[PDB]
C-alpha cells in the first residue's frame, strides 16, 4: 500500500538516535536526534527531546518519497547496559502517531555470546 523504509531507533541514555534509511540500508534519508533539539547536555536523552526529533524526522521522511517504515529499536548493548533508553519508546510513540504507517518492529541490540571484560573493574561503575 505504502512506500516502505527502515526506521531504526538507537536509544541509549544521555541521547536518543532516530534516523530512517532505504529498506536495504545503504542509502539513508534524514536523521536528527534528541541532542539536536535541546541545549543543556543533561537533557539530551529525555522523551521531550526525542519527540521533537521524531517530529523533524517525520517531516523529512515524508518530504523525500517515504510514507511508511519498519522500526528496529536498540539499546547500547555489547558489554553495556542492554536495557532500552528512556527516549526510544517515546521517540517511537511520537513517530507512530504521525501518519507514517508502521509494520513489524523487532529489537536489534547487540548481545554477545557474552564476553570482552566489562569496563569498571571489580568495584563496577555507575552509582
Amino acid at each position: 500500500s505504502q512506500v516502505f523504509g527502515v526506521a531504526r531507533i538507537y536509544a541509549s541514555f544521555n541521547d536518543t538516535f532516530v534516523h530512517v534509511t532505504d529498506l536495504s540500508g545503504k542509502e539513508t534519508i534524514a536523521r536528527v536526534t534528541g541532542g539536536m533539539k535541546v541545549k543543556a547536555d543533561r537533557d539530551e536523552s529525555s522523551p521531550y527531546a526525542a519527540m521533537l526529533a521524531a517530529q523533524d524526522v517525520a517531516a523529512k521522511c515524508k518530504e523525500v518519497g517515504i510514507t511508511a517504515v519498519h522500526v528496529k529499536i536498540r539499546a547500547t548493548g555489547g558489554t553495556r547496559t542492554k536495557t532500552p533508553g528512556p527516549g526510544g519508546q517515546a521517540a517511537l510513540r511520537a513517530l507512530a502517531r504521525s501518519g507514517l504507517r508502521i509494520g513489524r518492529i523487532e529489537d536489534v541490540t547487540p548481545v554477545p555470546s557474552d564476553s570482552t571484560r566489562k569496563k569498571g573493574g571489580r568495584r563496577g561503575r555507575r552509582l
Binding site: 512506500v3 516502505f4 532505504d22 529498506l23 536495504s24 545503504k26 542509502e27 534519508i29 523525500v64 518519497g65 509494520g103 513489524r104
Partner: peptide
C-alpha cells in the same frame, strides 16, 4: 521495495552502486 541511487553519470554511475546491495525482508511479508 524501492531504493535511491544517484544518476548514472559519466565517471561514477548508478549501475555500480545497485549490484552489491542486500535486503532483509521477513518472508511473511
Amino acid at each position: 521495495g524501492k531504493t535511491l541511487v544517484n544518476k548514472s553519470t559519466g565517471l561514477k554511475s548508478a549501475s555500480d552502486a545497485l549490484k552489491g546491495r542486500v535486503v532483509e525482508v521477513c518472508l511473511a511479508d
